[PDB]
Amino acid sequence: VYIHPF
Amino acid sequence: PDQSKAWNRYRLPNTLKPDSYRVTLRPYLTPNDRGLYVFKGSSTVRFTCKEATDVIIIHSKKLNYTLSQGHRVVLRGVGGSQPPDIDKTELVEPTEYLVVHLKGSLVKDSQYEMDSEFEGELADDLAGFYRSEYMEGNVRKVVATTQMQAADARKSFPCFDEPAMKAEFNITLIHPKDLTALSNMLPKGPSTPLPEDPNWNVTEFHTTPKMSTYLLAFIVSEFDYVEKQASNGVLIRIWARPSAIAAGHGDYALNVTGPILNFFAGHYDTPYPLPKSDQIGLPDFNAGAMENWGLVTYRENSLLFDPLSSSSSNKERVVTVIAHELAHQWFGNLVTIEWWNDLWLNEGFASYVEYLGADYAEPTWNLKDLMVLNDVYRVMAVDALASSHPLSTPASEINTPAQISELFDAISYSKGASVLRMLSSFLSEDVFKQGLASYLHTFAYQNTIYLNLWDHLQEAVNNRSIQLPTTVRDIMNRWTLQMGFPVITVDTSTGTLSQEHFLLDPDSNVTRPSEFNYVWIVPITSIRDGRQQQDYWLIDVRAQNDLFSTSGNEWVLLNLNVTGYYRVNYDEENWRKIQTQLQRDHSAIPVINRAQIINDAFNLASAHKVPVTLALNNTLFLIEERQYMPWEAALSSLSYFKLMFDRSEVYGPMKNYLKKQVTPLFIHFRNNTNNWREIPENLMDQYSEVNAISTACSNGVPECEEMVSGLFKQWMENPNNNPIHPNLRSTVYCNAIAQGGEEEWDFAWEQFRNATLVNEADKLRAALACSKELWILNRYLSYTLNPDLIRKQDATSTIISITNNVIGQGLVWDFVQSNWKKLFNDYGGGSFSFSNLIQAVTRRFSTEYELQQLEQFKKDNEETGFGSGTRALEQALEKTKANIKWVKENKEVVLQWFTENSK
Ligand SMILES: *[C@@H]1O[C@H](CO)[C@@H](O[C@@H]2O[C@H](CO)[C@@H](O[C@@H]3O[C@H](CO)[C@@H](O)[C@H](O)[C@@H]3O)[C@H](O)[C@H]2NC(C)=O)[C@H](O)[C@H]1NC(C)=O
Ligand SMILES: *[C@@H]1O[C@H](CO)[C@@H](O[C@@H]2O[C@H](CO)[C@@H](O)[C@H](O)[C@H]2NC(C)=O)[C@H](O)[C@H]1NC(C)=O
Ligand SMILES: *[C@@H]1O[C@H](CO)[C@@H](O)[C@H](O)[C@H]1NC(C)=O
Ligand SMILES: *[C@@H]1O[C@H](CO)[C@@H](O)[C@H](O)[C@H]1NC(C)=O
Ligand SMILES: *[C@@H]1O[C@H](CO)[C@@H](O)[C@H](O)[C@H]1NC(C)=O
Ligand SMILES: *[C@@H]1O[C@H](CO)[C@@H](O)[C@H](O)[C@H]1NC(C)=O
Ligand SMILES: *[C@@H]1O[C@H](CO)[C@@H](O)[C@H](O)[C@H]1NC(C)=O
Numbered sequence: 001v002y003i004h005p006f
Numbered sequence: 007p008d009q010s011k012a013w014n015r016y017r018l019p020n021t022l023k024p025d026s027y028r029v030t031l032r033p034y035l036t037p038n039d040r041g042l043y044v045f046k047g048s049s050t051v052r053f054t055c056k057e058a059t060d061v062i063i064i065h066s067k068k069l070n071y072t073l074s075q076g077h078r079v080v081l082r083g084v085g086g087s088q089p090p091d092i093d094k095t096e097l098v099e100p101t102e103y104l105v106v107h108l109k110g111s112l113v114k115d116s117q118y119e120m121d122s123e124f125e126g127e128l129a130d131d132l133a134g135f136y137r138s139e140y141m142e143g144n145v146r147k148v149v150a151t152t153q154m155q156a157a158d159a160r161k162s163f164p165c166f167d168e169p170a171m172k173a174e175f176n177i178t179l180i181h182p183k184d185l186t187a188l189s190n191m192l193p194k195g196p197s198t199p200l201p202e203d204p205n206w207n208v209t210e211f212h213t214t215p216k217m218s219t220y221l222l223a224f225i226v227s228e229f230d231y232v233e234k235q236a237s238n239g240v241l242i243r244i245w246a247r248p249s250a251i252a253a254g255h256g257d258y259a260l261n262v263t264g265p266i267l268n269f270f271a272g273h274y275d276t277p278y279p280l281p282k283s284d285q286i287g288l289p290d291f292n293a294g295a296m297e298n299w300g301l302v303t304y305r306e307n308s309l310l311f312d313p314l315s316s317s318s319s320n321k322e323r324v325v326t327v328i329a330h331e332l333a334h335q336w337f338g339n340l341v342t343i344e345w346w347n348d349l350w351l352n353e354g355f356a357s358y359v360e361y362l363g364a365d366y367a368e369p370t371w372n373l374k375d376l377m378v379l380n381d382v383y384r385v386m387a388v389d390a391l392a393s394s395h396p397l398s399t400p401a402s403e404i405n406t407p408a409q410i411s412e413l414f415d416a417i418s419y420s421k422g423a424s425v426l427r428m429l430s431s432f433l434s435e436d437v438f439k440q441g442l443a444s445y446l447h448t449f450a451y452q453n454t455i456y457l458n459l460w461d462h463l464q465e466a467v468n469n470r471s472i473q474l475p476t477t478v479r480d481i482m483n484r485w486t487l488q489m490g491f492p493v494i495t496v497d498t499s500t501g502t503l504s505q506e507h508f509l510l511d512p513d514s515n516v517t518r519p520s521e522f523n524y525v526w527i528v529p530i531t532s533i534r535d536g537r538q539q540q541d542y543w544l545i546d547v548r549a550q551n552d553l554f555s556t557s558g559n560e561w562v563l564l565n566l567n568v569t570g571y572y573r574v575n576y577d578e579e580n581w582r583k584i585q586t587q588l589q590r591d592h593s594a595i596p597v598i599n600r601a602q603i604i605n606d607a608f609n610l611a612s613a614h615k616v617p618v619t620l621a622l623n624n625t626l627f628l629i630e631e632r633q634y635m636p637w638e639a640a641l642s643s644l645s646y647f648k649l650m651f652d653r654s655e656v657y658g659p660m661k662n663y664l665k666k667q668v669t670p671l672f673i674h675f676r677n678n679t680n681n682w683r684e685i686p687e688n689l690m691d692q693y694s695e696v697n698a699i700s701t702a703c704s705n706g707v708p709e710c711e712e713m714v715s716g717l718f719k720q721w722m723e724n725p726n727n728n729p730i731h732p733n734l735r736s737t738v739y740c741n742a743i744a745q746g747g748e749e750e751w752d753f754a755w756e757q758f759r760n761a762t763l764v765n766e767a768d769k770l771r772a773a774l775a776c777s778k779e780l781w782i783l784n785r786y787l788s789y790t791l792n793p794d795l796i797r798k799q800d801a802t803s804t805i806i807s808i809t810n811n812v813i814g815q816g817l818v819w820d821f822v823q824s825n826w827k828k829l830f831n832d833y834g835g836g837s838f839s840f841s842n843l844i845q846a847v848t849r850r851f852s853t854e855y856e857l858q859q860l861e862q863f864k865k866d867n868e869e870t871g872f873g874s875g876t877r878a879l880e881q882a883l884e885k886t887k888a889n890i891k892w893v894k895e896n897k898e899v900v901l902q903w904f905t906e907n908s909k
Contacts (some may be wrong), residue, residue, distance in 0.1 A: 006418070
């Protein structure tokens with residue numbers, strides 16, 4: 001999955 | 007829960023291995039009598055018995071079985087095998103198994119088939135086979151769609167749902183005759199009427215390659231698409247709601263997708279083997295995107311792009327997310343992690359390689375430089391804790407779906423990417439990609455662990471006769487098997503270097519042992535008065551080399567362009583020469599190293615390795631810095647000061663200081679853009695402009711406050727003629743709401759409810775959390791929890807936006823303590839990024855009072871647990887303890903520094 005950098 | 011029984015253990019037995027599956031699924035897109043949306047399916051799995059056993063343990067989650075010949079399943083032989091009779095079956099819920107107890111044992115190296123018929127809820131829960139909804143005018147459109155990763159394929163059909171259980175899949179979808187069925191592969195023959203009911207069609211798809219269950223996708227919709235054959239002959243289609251496609255909002259994705267796919271195929275000398283790669287944007291989607299092999303799914307927001315309303319940052323997001331998902335076709339799909347403990351082999355690669363693909367499609371943006379901020383410095387915050395974890399965690403520790411989901415984190419993604427960036431730097435990308443080509447060729451359609459990668463990189467190193475201080479495995483094992491990173495401390499008077507494990511809190515307690523003693527093997531690049539020196543390898547805890555010695559006016563810096571995953575400290579004399587250089591001509595230091603000097607010194611100060619005033623002194627030159635990156639590094643580091651101090655007497659002087667530092671830049675942009683009529687040509691300058699506005703407004707520059715209120719007022723007077731350039735909307739909306747009242751808030755909320763693009767809605771949704779009115783924040787919090795107002799996919803993201811507002815801190819923390827079961831159960835307690843909410847609500851904590859609340863929160867909820875947020879709570883506890891001491895030690899010196907330097 002792509003998860004946006006938190 | 008008896009641990010001696012296999013069906014009570016989380017890992018599947020090794021006794022059975024699937025070969026191939028057929029699956030038929032049929033979503034019902036209108037509610038039944040109960041008002042429940044359901045799907046009905048059947049499956050046959052063919053598998054090989056590898057070791058004689060009298061039980062079939064296979065994953066099953068929230069599936070109901072239709073009895074067949076007296077049991078939940080039927081078991082048949084293959085090629086003459088003769089399976090025992092089924093005794094009974096059971097569903098074991100914690101481990102999510104269907105367990106088939108047999109009256110005898112299966113035979114080693116024989117094949118068997120098992121048939122199932124089942125039904126599940128097509129829930130609005132964003133997992134497995136689920137429903138997404140949107141409106142076209144007043145007509146409700148319902149989409150059947152999927153998300154399997156990590157452990158949800160088993161929620162759609164019974165399967166051996168672990169990534170090393172690769173098989174071929176034969177998918178049939180049964181669907182309303184008017185709707186299009188999509189899956190990984192192309193249809194196998196044309197779509198035919200269901201005999202019992204010709205209102206439905208039956209679409210069978212060609213067999214997949216051998217692949218992991220988590221990569222399966224099944225979609226039924228009336229989406230439209232644009233399409234283009236890529237230069238490698240692969241068919242690309244971009245699918246989305248009809249109105250978006252007609253509006254041309256898929257056109258940018260179509261422009262970049264095929265060319266990036268072809269670029270990766272070329273760079274890694276490894277073709278993409280499928281006939282097509284569909285990209286599809288869903289109105290409801292948990293993560294950012296999912297790399298399903300042949301049918302990559304996205305949030306609408308990350309695929310669609312409107313050139314007349316989306317920002318440049320939105321455009322960067324589209325191309326980078328596409329690049330990341332396309333990277334996965336190689337690193338994750340063709341070659342797959344053996345188990346989730348080595349996740350970085352999928353996601354660390356995708357996070358690194360995404361920049362190469364995005365840079366191919368958009369070479370003028372210079373996106374690769376942003377790795378330092380977006381990855382290196384992002385992950386270094388968590389990786390400087392005693393409660394961080396290695397890139398490759400021991401496989402034995404990672405067992406449950408919660409523990410698996412938790413690993414989708416900054417370590418696996420950004421530390422993975424950072425270590426690969428370092429590796430490519432010391433090998434050269436030419437050599438790196440040669441080893442990767444060999445890796446991909448060898449393990450195509452198979453599974454890997456970290457050791458397999460080093461073997462193939464070693465092969466390239468050996469072919470090129472490259473001499474390293476030891477093998478690739480022994481260098482890279484230092485960065486992979488132990489957590490953390492070193493600080494490299496230089497004494498420029500003697501030229502000595504020393505390394506130690508960098509910890510934000512010296513007092514913190516590292517309980518995880520390292521067989522490498524927290525010592526690294528470090529490639530050290532460096533510059534002397536701007537000129538690059540010979541490379542150096544630091545292998546010991548300390549060394550001496552004249553490369554690192556200075557005399558007279560000379561300065562040195564290590565880690566040119568921050569290619570290496572480490573921080574750097576110097577003797578205070580060299581630091582003073584660096585500060586002199588920044589005052590004399592800051593352009594003499596490469597821009598990335600200007601960000602480095604700032605970010606490193608702030609972190610070093612937290613760790614008590616340099617005085618805090620040294621780190622603050624490193625920001626003085628920013629008053630004449632125009633580049634995006636060093637300002638972003640400063641703002642990022644000063645975020646921590648804001649968290650520590652924005653409820654204290656230190657805050658006014660802090661804001662005064664930032665107002666002084668940013669005012670010339672703000673005035674520069676006011677003039678340069680011809681009073682905000684234009685945006686800069688260069689992407690970095692565009693970002694620099696947005697930060698200068700955000701910083702000016704937040705810290706009380708009166709011209710900025712006037713500008714944003716005036717623009718927002720002009721929009722309210724002309725709702726259909728938005729005068730605000732897309733790049734400025736987020737910051738103008740937020741600051742206009744903050745400076746305004748309920749009239750501005752209500753206008754923005756109405757705009758949000760009426761929005762046609764997710765991008766515009768997202769900016770408004772973040773902006774509404776900027777209100778300074780406690781009562782408005784409370785009302786807004788109640789909306790985040792209402793799926794008719796804010797889509798479920800966005801609920802916790804909006805709650806985070808609220809808690810980041812100083813007035814929403816108490817509000818949200820009190821809410822979290824009061825509603826833990828609900829958040830855990832309904833808002834993703836075992837899924838991706840649940841850590842985000844724990845991190846956000848706790849990062850202001852700097853008091854004994856707050857610490858005691860947090861410890862009591864841990865005690866009070868021990869029965870519910872913290873799911874995929876378990877490590878984040880441990881990290882919150884460590885950070886909170888560090889913060890208490892840091893505030894005690896720094897508040898008076900910081901107050902005095904901001905006061906003395908802001909005038
Ligand atoms: C999913 O669909 C695939 C593709 O149609 C199925 O693979 C096919 O399976 C058949 C029957 O098992 C294979 O037959 C085998 O052929 C050789 C004879 O040369 C022999 O060694 C075996 O004894 C067996 O008879 C056939 O080769 C194969 N076709 C292809 C293209 O691979 C698969 O069975 C389906 N899986 C399920 C669970 O329905
Ligand atoms: C460190 O990074 C900088 C900034 O990206 C590099 O400077 C670029 O160099 C390329 C090739 O020489 C030029 O086309 C550009 O003018 C520079 N780009 C930018 C954005 O400034 C520099 O080459 C790097 N240093 C080393 C040794 O790699
Ligand atoms: C599955 O069975 C349970 C228990 O009878 C029931 O509550 C649930 O509604 C069923 N689910 C579906 C989708 O039919
Ligand atoms: C449904 O079936 C007919 C053939 O009987 C076909 O022409 C039509 O395109 C099918 N529709 C879809 C959306 O697959
Ligand atoms: C895609 O590329 C075409 C052809 O170069 C160009 O005209 C168009 O503006 C691009 N579309 C988008 C949305 O970037
Ligand atoms: C190394 O060279 C051998 C012998 O020429 C070749 O077969 C192999 O593919 C090469 N491996 C790599 C990683 O370049
Ligand atoms: C920060 O700068 C001031 C002079 O501008 C100096 O007095 C102070 O010592 C500096 N702090 C450190 C740690 O060098």
